[PDB]
């Protein structure tokens, strides 16, 4: 895609990102560094060694890079092997778990599937809910998408759409405020 | 000589060691430099780097010039032959009498 | 890959350095200067607690 993020940072963890990225994207492979990151998270959580290691600071370069090794040297892109040998030569293996987040989040930017909420006060019949659907997909129309419900809202009988980062307001408690103010702004 | 000049600011002057470090206020000396050039340890500003003030001119320095950690603070000549004598900072004789 | 690699990162960790010492206790100073020290791995200490250093000094 030409092979530039979707976003330029100067963050610590957001310039490490996004060359990665780009890096990744450049030659062929970027689901390849995709679950490498990935298995740091999951590692970085589940693994509490794993997390004293680096937020270790106090620790040397030499001695970084023998258990970083020790790890795996076999499974990860030669992209994030750089990446982490560029760390600890730049002492920048404290942010290491913010960085394959950060990575993360572009390589989800990427993805085109995306999830819908829709935001309800009354209960959605399983029938009503199917014509929900017809509409929502003759809305779009040319991209998969995935539905979450949630209601718990203060309006009533009101629509609300969330959908990834777009927010459509269909509720009636938006009507009643819009006539209510218009009403009363007569100045006849 | 296990310390490196990892940056040079004008007259401070870092040095990458490796291993143990200088203790501070110790006296370091420049290896290299056209006249002696003793470098004053100041504090320890971390990741294997010191700072140091030097006490001659840092002119024609180089990253990466090999510096000698002497193990104490600066040490001057004491005693009845500096009488009389012109002494330098650094404890070289500037009277041009030996 | 696997999940389980934390018991190799743990026995590297133990013989790749000879450091890392009871960290509940013990501390380590990443840095010194202006009468100032950035102590390491020094949890569970007290805001106000009395420290003690190699040297003796307090």
Same mark, same amino acid.
């Given at each position: 895609?030409?092979?530039?993020?979707?976003?330029?940072?100067?963050?610590?963890?957001?310039?490490?990102?996004?060359?990665?990225?780009?890096?990744?994207?450049?030659?062929?492979?970027?689901?390849?560094?995709?679950?490498? #990151?990935?298995?740091?998270?999951?590692?970085?959580?589940?693994?509490?060694?794993?997390?004293?290691?680096?937020?270790?600071?106090?620790?040397?370069?030499?001695?970084?890079?023998?258990?970083?090794?020790?790890?795996?040297?076999?499974?990860?892109?030669?992209?994030?092997?750089?990446?982490?040998?560029?760390?600890?030569?730049?002492?920048?293996?404290?942010?290491?778990?913010?960085?394959?987040?950060?990575? #993360?989040?572009?390589?989800?930017?990427?993805?085109?599937?995306?999830?819908?909420?829709?935001?309800?006060?009354?209960?959605?019949?399983?029938?009503?809910?199917?014509?929900?659907?017809?509409?929502?997909?003759?809305?779009?129309?040319?991209?998969?998408?995935?539905?979450?419900?949630?209601?718990?809202?203060?309006?009533?009988?009101?629509?609300? #759409?969330?959908?990834?980062?777009?927010?459509?307001?269909?509720?009636?408690?938006?009507?009643?405020?819009?006539?209510?103010?218009?009403?009363?702004?007569?100045?006849? | 000589?296990? $310390?490196?000049?990892?940056?040079?600011? $004008?007259?401070?002057?870092? %040095?990458?060691?490796? &291993?143990?470090?200088?203790?501070?206020?110790?006296?370091?000396? %420049?290896? &290299?430099?056209?006249?002696?050039?003793?470098?004053?340890?100041?504090?320890?500003? &971390?990741?294997?780097?010191?700072?140091?003030?030097?006490?001659?001119?840092?002119?024609?320095?180089?990253?990466?010039?090999?510096?000698?950690?002497? $193990?104490?603070?600066?040490?001057?000549?004491?005693?009845?032959?500096?009488?009389?004598?012109?002494?330098?900072?650094?404890?070289?004789?500037?009277?041009?009498?030996? | 890959?696997?999940?389980?690699?934390?018991?190799?990162?743990?026995?590297?960790? @133990?013989?790749?350095?000879?450091?890392?010492?009871?960290?509940?206790?013990?501390?380590?100073?990443?840095?010194?200067?202006?009468? @100032?020290?950035?102590?390491?791995?020094?949890?569970?200490?007290?805001?106000?607690?009395?420290?003690?250093?190699?040297?003796?000094?307090?």
């Amino acid at each position: 895609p030409g092979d530039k993020p979707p976003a330029i940072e100067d963050s610590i963890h957001g310039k490490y990102a996004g060359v990665l990225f780009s890096s990744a994207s450049s030659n062929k492979s970027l689901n390849k560094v995709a679950e490498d #990151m990935k298995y740091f998270n999951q590692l970085y959580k589940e693994s509490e060694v794993f997390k004293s290691f680096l937020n270790n600071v106090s620790l040397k370069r030499n001695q970084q890079r023998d258990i970083i090794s020790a790890l795996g040297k076999t499974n990860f892109n030669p992209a994030t092997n750089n990446l982490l040998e560029t760390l600890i030569e730049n002492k920048r293996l404290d942010s290491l778990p913010k960085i394959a987040e950060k990575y #993360m989040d572009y390589y989800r930017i990427l993805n085109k599937q995306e999830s819908i909420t829709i935001i309800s006060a009354q209960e959605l019949t399983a029938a009503e809910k199917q014509k929900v659907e017809q509409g929502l997909k003759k809305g779009n129309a040319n991209v998969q998408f995935t539905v979450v419900y949630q209601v718990d809202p203060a309006i009533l009988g009101g629509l609300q #759409m969330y959908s990834g980062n777009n927010f459509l307001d269909c509720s009636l408690l938006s009507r009643v405020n819009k006539l209510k103010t218009e009403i009363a702004k007569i100045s006849f | 000589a296990n $310390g490196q000049v990892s940056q040079v600011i $004008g007259a401070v002057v870092d %040095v990458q060691f490796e &291993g143990e470090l200088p203790q501070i206020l110790n006296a370091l000396e %420049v290896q &290299g430099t056209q006249h002696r050039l003793v470098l004053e340890v100041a504090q320890h500003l &971390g990741d294997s780097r010191v700072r140091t003030i030097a006490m001659d001119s840092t002119e024609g320095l180089v990253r990466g010039q090999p510096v000698v950690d002497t $193990g104490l603070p600066i040490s001057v000549p004491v005693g009845p032959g500096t009488l009389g004598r012109i002494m330098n900072v650094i404890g070289e004789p500037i009277d041009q009498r030996g | 890959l696997s999940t389980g690699e934390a018991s190799v990162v743990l026995a590297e960790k @133990i013989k790749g350095i000879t450091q890392q010492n009871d960290i509940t206790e013990y501390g380590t100073v990443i840095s010194i200067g202006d009468g @100032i020290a950035r102590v390491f791995g020094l949890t569970k200490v007290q805001a106000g607690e009395m420290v003690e250093f190699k040297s003796g000094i307090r």
